[PDB]
PDB file of C-alpha atoms in Angstrom:
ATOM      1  CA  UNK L   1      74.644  74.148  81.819  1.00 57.04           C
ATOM      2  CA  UNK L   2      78.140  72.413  82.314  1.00 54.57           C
ATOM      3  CA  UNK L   3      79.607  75.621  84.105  1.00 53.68           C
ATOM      4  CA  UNK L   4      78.771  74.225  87.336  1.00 49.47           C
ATOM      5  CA  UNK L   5      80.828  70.925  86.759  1.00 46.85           C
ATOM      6  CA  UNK L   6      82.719  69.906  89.677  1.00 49.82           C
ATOM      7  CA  UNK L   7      85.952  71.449  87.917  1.00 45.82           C
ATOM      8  CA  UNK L   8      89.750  71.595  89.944  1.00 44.74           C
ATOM      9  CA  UNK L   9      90.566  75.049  90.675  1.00 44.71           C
ATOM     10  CA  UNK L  10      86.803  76.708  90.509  1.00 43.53           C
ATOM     11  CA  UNK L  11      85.127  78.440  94.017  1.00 44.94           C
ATOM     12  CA  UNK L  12      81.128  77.474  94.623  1.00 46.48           C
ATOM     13  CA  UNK L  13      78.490  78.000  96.474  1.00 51.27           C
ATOM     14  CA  UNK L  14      77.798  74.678  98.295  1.00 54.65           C
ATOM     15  CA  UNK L  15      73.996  74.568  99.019  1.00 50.58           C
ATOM     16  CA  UNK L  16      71.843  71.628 100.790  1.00 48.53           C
ATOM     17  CA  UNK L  17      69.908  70.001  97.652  1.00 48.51           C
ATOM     18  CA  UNK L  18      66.309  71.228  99.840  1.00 50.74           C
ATOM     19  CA  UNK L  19      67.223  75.086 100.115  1.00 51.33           C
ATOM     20  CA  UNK L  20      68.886  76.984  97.148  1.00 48.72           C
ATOM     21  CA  UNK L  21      69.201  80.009  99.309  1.00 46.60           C
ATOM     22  CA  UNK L  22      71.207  78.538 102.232  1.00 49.02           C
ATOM     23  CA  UNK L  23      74.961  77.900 101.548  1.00 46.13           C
ATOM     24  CA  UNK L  24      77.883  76.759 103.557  1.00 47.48           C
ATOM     25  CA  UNK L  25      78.881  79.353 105.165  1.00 47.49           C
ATOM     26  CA  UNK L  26      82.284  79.711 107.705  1.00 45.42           C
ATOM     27  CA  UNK L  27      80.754  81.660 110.260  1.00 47.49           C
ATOM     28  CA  UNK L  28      84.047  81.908 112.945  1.00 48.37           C
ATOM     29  CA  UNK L  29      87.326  80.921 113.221  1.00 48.74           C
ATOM     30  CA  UNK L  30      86.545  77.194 112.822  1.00 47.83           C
ATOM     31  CA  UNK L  31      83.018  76.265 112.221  1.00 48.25           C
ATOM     32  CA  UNK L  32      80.864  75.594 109.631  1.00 50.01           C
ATOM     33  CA  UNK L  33      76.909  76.278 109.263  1.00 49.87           C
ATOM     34  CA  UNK L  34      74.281  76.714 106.132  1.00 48.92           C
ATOM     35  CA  UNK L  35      73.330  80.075 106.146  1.00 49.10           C
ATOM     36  CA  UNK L  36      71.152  82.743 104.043  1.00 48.58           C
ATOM     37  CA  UNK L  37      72.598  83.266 100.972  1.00 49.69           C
ATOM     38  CA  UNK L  38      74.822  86.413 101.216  1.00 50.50           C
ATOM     39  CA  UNK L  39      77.446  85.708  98.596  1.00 49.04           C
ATOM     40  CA  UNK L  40      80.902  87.022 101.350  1.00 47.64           C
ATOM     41  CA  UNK L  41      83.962  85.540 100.956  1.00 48.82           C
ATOM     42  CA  UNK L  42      83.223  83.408 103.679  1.00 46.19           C
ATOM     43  CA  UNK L  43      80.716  81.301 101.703  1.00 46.89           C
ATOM     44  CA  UNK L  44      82.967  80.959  98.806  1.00 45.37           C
ATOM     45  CA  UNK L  45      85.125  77.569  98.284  1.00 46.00           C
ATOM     46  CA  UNK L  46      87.374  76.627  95.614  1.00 42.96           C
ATOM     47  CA  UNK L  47      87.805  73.174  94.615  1.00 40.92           C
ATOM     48  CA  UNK L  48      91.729  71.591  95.045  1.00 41.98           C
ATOM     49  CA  UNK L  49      91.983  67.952  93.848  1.00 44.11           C
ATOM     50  CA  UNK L  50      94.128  65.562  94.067  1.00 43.13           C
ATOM     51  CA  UNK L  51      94.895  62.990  91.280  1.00 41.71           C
ATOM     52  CA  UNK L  52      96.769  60.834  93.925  1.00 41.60           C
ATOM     53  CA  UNK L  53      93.820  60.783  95.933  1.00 41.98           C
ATOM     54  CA  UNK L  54      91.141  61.124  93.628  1.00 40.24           C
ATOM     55  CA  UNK L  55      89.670  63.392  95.764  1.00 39.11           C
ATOM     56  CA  UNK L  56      89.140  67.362  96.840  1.00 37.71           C
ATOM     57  CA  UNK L  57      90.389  69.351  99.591  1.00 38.12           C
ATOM     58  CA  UNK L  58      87.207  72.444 100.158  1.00 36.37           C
ATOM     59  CA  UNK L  59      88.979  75.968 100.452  1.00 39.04           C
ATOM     60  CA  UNK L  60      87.295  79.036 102.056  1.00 37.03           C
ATOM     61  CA  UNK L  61      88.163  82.194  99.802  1.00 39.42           C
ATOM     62  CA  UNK L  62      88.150  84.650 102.650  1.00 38.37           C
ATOM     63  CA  UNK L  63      92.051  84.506 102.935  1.00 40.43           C
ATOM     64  CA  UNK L  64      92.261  82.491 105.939  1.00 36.54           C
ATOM     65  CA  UNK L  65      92.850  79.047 103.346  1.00 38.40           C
ATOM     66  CA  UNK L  66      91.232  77.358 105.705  1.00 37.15           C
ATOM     67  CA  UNK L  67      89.919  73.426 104.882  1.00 31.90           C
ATOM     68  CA  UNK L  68      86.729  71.742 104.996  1.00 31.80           C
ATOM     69  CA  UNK L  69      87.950  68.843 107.784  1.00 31.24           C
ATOM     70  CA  UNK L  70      86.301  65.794 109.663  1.00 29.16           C
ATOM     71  CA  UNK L  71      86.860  65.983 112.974  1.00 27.87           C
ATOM     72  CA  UNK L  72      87.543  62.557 113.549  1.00 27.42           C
ATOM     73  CA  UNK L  73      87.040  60.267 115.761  1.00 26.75           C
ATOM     74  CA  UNK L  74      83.819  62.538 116.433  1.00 28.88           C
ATOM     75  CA  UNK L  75      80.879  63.158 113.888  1.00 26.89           C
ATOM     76  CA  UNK L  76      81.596  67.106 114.029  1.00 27.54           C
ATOM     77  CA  UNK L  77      82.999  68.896 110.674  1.00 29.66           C
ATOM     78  CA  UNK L  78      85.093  72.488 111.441  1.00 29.95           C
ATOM     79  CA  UNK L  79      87.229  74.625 109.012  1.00 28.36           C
ATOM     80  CA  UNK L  80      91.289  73.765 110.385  1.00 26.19           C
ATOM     81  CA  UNK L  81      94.380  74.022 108.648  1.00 23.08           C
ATOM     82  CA  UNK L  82      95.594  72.589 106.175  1.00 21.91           C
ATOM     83  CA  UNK L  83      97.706  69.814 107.608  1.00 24.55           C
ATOM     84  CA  UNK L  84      97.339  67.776 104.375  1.00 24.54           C
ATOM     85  CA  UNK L  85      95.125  64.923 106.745  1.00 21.78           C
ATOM     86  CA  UNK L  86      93.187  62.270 104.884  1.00 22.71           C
ATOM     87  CA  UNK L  87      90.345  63.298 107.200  1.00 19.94           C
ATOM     88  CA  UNK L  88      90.920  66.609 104.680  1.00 22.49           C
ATOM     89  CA  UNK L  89      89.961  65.027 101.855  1.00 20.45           C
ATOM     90  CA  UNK L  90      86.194  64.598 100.376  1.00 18.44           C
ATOM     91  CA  UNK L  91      84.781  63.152  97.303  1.00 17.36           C
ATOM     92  CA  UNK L  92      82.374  65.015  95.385  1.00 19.19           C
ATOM     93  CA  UNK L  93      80.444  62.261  93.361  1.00 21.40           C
ATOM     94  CA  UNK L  94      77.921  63.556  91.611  1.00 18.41           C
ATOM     95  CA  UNK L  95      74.399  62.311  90.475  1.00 15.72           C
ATOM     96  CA  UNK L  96      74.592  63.868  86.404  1.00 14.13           C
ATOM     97  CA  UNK L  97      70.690  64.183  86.336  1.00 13.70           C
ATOM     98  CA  UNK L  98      69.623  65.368  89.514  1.00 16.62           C
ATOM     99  CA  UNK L  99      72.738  67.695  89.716  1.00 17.27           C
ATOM    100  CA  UNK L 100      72.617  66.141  93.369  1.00 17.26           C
ATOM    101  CA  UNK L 101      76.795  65.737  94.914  1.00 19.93           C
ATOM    102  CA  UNK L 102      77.488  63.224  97.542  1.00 24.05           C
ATOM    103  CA  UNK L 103      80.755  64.834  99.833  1.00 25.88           C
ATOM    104  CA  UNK L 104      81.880  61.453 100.944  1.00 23.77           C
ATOM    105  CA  UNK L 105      85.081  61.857 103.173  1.00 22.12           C
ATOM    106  CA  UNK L 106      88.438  60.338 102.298  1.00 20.71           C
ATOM    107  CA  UNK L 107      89.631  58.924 105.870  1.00 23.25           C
ATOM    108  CA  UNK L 108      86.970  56.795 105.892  1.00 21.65           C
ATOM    109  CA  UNK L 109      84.623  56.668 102.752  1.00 23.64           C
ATOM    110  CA  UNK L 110      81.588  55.394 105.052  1.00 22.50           C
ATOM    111  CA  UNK L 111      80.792  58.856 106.377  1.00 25.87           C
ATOM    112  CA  UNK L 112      79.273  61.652 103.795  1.00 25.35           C
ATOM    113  CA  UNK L 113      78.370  65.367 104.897  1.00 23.76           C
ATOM    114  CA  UNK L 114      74.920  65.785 105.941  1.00 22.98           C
ATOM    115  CA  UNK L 115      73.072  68.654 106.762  1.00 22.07           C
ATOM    116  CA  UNK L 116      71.041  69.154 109.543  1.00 24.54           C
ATOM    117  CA  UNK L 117      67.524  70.737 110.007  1.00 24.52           C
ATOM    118  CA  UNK L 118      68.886  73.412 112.514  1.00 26.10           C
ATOM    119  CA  UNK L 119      71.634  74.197 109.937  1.00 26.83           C
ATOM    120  CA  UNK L 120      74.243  72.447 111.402  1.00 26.29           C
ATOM    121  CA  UNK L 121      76.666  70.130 109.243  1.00 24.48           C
ATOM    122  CA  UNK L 122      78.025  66.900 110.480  1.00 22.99           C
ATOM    123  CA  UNK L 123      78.854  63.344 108.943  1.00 21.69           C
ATOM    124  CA  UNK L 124      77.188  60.303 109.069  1.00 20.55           C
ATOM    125  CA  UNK L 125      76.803  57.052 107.582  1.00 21.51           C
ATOM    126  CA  UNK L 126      75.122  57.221 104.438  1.00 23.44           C
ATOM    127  CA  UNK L 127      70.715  56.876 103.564  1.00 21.98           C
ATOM    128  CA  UNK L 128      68.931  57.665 101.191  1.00 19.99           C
ATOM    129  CA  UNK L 129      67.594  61.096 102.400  1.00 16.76           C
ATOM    130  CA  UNK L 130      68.004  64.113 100.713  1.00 14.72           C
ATOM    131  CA  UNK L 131      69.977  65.391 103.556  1.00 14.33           C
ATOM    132  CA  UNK L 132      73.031  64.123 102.474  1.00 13.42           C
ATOM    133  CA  UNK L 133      72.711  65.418  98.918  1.00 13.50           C
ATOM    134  CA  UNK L 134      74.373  68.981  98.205  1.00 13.78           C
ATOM    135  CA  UNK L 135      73.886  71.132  94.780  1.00 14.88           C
ATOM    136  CA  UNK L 136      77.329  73.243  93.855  1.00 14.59           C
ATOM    137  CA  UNK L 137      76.783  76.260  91.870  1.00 16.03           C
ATOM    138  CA  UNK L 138      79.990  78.454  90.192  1.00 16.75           C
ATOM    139  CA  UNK L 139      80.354  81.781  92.152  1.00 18.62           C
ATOM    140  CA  UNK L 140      81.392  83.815  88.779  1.00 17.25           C
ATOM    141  CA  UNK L 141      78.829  81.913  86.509  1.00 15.16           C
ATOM    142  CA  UNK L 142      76.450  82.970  89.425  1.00 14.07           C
ATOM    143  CA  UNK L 143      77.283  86.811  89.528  1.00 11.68           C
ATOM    144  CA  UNK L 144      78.787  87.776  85.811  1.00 13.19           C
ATOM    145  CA  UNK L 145      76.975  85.416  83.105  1.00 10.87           C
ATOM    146  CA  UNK L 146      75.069  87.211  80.572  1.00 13.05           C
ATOM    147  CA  UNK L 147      76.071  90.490  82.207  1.00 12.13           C
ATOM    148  CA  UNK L 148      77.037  94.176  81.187  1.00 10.69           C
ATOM    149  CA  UNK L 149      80.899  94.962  83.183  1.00  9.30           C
ATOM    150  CA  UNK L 150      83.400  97.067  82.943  1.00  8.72           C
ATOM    151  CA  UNK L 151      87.299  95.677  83.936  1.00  7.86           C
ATOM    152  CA  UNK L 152      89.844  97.609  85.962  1.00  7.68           C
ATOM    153  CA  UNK L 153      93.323  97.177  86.341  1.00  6.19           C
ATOM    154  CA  UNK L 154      94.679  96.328  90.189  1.00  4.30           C
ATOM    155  CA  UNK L 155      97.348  98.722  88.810  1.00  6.18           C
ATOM    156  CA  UNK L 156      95.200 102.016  89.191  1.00  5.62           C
ATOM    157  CA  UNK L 157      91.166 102.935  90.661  1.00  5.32           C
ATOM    158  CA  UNK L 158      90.911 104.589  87.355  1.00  4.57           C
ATOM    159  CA  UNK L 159      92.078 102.408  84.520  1.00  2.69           C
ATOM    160  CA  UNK L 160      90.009 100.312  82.398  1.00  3.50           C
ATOM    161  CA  UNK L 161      89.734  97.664  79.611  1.00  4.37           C
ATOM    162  CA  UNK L 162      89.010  99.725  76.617  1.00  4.48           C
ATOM    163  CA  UNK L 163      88.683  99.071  72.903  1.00  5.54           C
ATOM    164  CA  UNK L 164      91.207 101.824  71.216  1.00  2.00           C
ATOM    165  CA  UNK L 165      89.500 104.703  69.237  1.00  2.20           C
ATOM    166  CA  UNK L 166      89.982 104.070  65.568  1.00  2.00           C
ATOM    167  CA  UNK L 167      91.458 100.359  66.030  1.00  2.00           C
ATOM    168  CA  UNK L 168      91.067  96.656  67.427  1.00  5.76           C
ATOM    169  CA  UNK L 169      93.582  97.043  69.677  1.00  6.16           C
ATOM    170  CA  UNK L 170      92.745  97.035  73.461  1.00  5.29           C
ATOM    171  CA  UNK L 171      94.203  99.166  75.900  1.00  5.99           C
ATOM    172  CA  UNK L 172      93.854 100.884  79.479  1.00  5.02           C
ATOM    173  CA  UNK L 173      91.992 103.888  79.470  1.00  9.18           C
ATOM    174  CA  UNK L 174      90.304 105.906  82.363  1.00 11.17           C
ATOM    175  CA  UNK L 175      86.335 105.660  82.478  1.00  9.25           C
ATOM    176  CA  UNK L 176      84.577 108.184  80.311  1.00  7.67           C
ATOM    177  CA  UNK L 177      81.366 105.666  80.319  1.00  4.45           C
ATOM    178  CA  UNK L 178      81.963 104.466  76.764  1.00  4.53           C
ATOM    179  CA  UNK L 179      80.721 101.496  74.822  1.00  2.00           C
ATOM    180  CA  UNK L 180      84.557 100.760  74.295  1.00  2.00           C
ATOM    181  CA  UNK L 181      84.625 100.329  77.874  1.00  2.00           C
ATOM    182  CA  UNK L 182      81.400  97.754  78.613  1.00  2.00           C
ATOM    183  CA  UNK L 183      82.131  94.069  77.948  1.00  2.00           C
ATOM    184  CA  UNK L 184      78.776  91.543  78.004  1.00  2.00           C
ATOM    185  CA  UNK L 185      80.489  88.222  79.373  1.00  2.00           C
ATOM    186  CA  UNK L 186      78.561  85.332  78.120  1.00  2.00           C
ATOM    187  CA  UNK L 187      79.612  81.719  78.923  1.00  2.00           C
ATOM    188  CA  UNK L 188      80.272  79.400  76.370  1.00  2.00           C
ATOM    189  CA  UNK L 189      78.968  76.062  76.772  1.00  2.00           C
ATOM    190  CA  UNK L 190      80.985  74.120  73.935  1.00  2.00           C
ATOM    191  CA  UNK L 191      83.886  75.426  75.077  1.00  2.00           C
ATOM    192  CA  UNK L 192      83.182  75.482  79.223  1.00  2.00           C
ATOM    193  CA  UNK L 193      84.429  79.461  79.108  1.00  2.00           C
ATOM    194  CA  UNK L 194      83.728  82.668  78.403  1.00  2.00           C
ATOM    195  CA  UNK L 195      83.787  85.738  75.537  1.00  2.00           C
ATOM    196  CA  UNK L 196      83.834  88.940  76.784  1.00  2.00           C
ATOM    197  CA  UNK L 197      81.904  91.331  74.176  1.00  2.00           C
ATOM    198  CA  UNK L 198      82.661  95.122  73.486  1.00  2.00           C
ATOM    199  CA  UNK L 199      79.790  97.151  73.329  1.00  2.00           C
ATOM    200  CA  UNK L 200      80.775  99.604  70.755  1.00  2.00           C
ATOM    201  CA  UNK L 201      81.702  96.810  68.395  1.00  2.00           C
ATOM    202  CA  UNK L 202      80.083  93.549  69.199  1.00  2.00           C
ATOM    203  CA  UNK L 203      83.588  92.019  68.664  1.00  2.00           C
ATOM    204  CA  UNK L 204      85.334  89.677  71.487  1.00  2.00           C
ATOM    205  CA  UNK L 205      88.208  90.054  73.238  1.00  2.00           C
ATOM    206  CA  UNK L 206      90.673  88.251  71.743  1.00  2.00           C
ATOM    207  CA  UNK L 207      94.072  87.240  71.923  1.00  2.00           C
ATOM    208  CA  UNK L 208      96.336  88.127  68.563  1.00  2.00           C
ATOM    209  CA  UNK L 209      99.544  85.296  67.924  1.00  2.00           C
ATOM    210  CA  UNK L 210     102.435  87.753  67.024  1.00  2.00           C
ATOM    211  CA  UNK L 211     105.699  88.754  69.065  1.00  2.00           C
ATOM    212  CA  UNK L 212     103.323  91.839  70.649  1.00  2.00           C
ATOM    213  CA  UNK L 213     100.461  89.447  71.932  1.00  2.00           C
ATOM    214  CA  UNK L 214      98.241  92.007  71.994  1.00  2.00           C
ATOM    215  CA  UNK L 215      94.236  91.810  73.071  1.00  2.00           C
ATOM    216  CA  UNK L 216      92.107  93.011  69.855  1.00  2.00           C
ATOM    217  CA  UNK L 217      88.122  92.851  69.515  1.00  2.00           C
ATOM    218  CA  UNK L 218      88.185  90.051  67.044  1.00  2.00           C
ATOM    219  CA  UNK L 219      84.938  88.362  65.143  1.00  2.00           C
ATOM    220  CA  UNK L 220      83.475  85.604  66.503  1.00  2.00           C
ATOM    221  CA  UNK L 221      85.740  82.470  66.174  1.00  2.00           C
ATOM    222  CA  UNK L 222      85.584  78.802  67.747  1.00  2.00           C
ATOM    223  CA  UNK L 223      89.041  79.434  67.836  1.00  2.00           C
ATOM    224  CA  UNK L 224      90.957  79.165  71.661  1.00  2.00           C
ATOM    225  CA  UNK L 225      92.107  82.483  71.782  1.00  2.00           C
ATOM    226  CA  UNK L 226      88.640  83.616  72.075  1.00  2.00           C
ATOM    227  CA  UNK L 227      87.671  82.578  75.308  1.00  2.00           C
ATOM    228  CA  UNK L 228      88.626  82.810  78.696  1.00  2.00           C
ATOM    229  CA  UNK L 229      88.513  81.470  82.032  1.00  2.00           C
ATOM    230  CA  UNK L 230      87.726  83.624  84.427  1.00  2.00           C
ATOM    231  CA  UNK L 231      88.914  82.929  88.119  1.00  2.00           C
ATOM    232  CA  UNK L 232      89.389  84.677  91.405  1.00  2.00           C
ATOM    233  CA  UNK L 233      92.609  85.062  92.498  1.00  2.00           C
ATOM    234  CA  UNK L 234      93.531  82.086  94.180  1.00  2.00           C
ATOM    235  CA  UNK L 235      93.432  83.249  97.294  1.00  2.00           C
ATOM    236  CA  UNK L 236      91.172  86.674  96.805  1.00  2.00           C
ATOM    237  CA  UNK L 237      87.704  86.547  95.911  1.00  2.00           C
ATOM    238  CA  UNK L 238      88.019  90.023  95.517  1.00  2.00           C
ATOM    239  CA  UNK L 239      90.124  90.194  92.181  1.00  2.00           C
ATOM    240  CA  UNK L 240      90.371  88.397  89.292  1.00  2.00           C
ATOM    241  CA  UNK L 241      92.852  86.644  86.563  1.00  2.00           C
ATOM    242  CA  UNK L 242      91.723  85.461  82.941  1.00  2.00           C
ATOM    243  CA  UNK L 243      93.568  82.918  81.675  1.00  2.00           C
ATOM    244  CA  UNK L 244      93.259  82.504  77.911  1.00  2.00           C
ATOM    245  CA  UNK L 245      92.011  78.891  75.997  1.00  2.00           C
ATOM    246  CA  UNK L 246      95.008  78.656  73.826  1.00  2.00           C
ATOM    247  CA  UNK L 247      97.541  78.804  76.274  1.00  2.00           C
ATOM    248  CA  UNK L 248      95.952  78.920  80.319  1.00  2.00           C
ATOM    249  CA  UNK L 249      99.551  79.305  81.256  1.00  2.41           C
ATOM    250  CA  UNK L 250      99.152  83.089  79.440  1.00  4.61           C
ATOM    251  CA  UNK L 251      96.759  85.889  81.077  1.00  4.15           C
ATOM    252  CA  UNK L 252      95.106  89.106  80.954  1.00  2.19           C
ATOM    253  CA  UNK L 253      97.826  91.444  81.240  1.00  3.04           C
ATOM    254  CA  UNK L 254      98.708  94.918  81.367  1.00  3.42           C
ATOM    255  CA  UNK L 255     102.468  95.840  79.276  1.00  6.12           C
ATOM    256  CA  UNK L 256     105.331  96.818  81.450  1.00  3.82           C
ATOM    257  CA  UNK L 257     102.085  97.157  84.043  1.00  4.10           C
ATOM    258  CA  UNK L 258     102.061 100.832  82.938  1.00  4.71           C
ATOM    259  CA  UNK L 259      99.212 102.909  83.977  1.00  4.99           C
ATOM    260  CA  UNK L 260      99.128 105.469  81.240  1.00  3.98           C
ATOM    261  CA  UNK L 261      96.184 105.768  78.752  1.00  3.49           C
ATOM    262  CA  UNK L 262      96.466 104.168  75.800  1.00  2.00           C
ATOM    263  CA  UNK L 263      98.873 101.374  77.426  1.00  2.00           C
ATOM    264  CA  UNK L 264      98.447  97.861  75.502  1.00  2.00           C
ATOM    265  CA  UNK L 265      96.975  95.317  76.959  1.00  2.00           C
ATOM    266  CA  UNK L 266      98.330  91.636  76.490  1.00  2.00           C
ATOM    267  CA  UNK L 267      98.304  88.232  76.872  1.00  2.00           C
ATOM    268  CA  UNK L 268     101.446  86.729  79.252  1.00  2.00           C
ATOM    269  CA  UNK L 269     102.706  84.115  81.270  1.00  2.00           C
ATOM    270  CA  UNK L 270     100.867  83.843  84.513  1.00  2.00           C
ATOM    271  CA  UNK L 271     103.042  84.926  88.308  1.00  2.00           C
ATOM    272  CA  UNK L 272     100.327  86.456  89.526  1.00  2.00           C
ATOM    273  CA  UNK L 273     100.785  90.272  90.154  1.00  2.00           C
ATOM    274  CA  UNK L 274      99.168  93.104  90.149  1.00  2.00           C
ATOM    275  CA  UNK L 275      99.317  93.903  86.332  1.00  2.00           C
ATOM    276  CA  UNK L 276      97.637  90.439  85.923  1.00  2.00           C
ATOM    277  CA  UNK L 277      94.818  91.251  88.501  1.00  2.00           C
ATOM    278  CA  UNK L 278      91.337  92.716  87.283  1.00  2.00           C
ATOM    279  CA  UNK L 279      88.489  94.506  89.326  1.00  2.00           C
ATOM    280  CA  UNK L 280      85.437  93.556  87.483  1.00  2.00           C
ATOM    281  CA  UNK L 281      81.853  94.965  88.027  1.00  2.00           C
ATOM    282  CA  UNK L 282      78.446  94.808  86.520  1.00  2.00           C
ATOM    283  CA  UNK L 283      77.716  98.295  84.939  1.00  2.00           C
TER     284      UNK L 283
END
């Protein structure tokens, strides 16, 4: 698969290449240790990069935006703010076969992460061992690929994405456990996103070009407004925003962010609140 490219802007799990069950995992305030797999907040990082730089700062999702950082002059690595040092900054090079990613650090490009055998992280001058070699793997490819969910508005507990009775168009409506209701999300390689499928249908959410910019279950198309990427909110890895193919400036939306049944749902330009925000679990 490609959804685990080394993409700006998408959170991973960061495991050592010998163990896909440990993770790096932000255990305190400021450090940093593989741990058993547990899939928190805390073991979620989103990718930042910088074209300047050509390489990444490493975000923590549990809303303390903390940074991956080299504690230099020593060999230590800790989680600190973001002070925008070059010591901040990794590379993520990555071996295309193996899947293998070196995390070579920016302030001085002779040190790469390493891994420990008691867990610990630290960097060191580079070997050939396979403790220096990390696999990434995409949170939401991880947890929602291939699977049965239902979507709810941030806006209200009890309002979901639901196909309208007797139409394409896609509205809120409060959970009645209805095939209009259950959405199979299935990457798409070719396109490096996803369709979201209706259950009662077997047509895709899809965004329709008019003045209204309504959501419909559409056919299958290779056209953009098919597919979406589907992101935590940038700082929340409990909530999510799908930005749409054709335009990733537009998202998921709910009109006028009424609540009401029946309310149209829509594609618009992305600021970020609560009307744009979506709970989504597996059925």
């Amino acid at each position: 698969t490609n959804a685990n490219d080394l993409r700006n802007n998408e959170v991973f799990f960061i495991s050592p290449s010998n163990n896909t069950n440990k993770v790096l995992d932000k255990i305190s305030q400021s450090e940093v240790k593989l741990w058993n797999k547990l899939s928190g907040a805390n073991q979620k990082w989103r990718l930042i990069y910088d074209t300047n730089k050509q390489a990444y700062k490493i975000k923590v999702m549990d809303n303390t935006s903390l940074i991956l950082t080299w504690n230099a002059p020593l060999s230590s690595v800790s989680v600190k703010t973001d002070t925008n040092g070059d010591n901040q900054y990794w590379y993520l090079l990555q071996n295309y076969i193996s899947r293998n990613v070196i995390i070579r650090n920016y302030m001085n490009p002779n040190l790469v992460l390493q891994y420990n055998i008691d867990d610990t992280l630290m960097v060191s001058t580079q070997t050939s061992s396979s403790n220096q070699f990390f696999k990434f793997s995409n949170c939401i490819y991880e947890a929602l690929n291939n699977r049965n969910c239902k979507l709810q508005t941030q806006l209200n507990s009890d309002r979901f994405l639901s196909k309208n009775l007797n139409s394409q168009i896609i509205v809120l409506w409060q959970w009645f456990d209805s095939s209009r209701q259950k959405w199979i999300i299935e990457y798409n390689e070719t396109k490096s996103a996803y369709t979201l499928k209706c259950q009662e249908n077997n047509r895709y959410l899809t965004w329709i070009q008019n003045s209204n910019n309504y959501v419909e279950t559409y056919q299958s198309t290779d056209s953009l407004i098919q597919y979406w990427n589907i992101n935590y909110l940038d700082n929340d890895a409990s909530k999510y925003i799908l930005y749409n193919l054709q335009d990733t400036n537009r998202v998921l939306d709910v009109y006028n962010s009424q609540i009401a049944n029946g309310t149209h749902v829509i594609v618009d330009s992305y600021h970020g609140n609560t009307n744009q925000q979506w709970i989504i679990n597996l059925i």
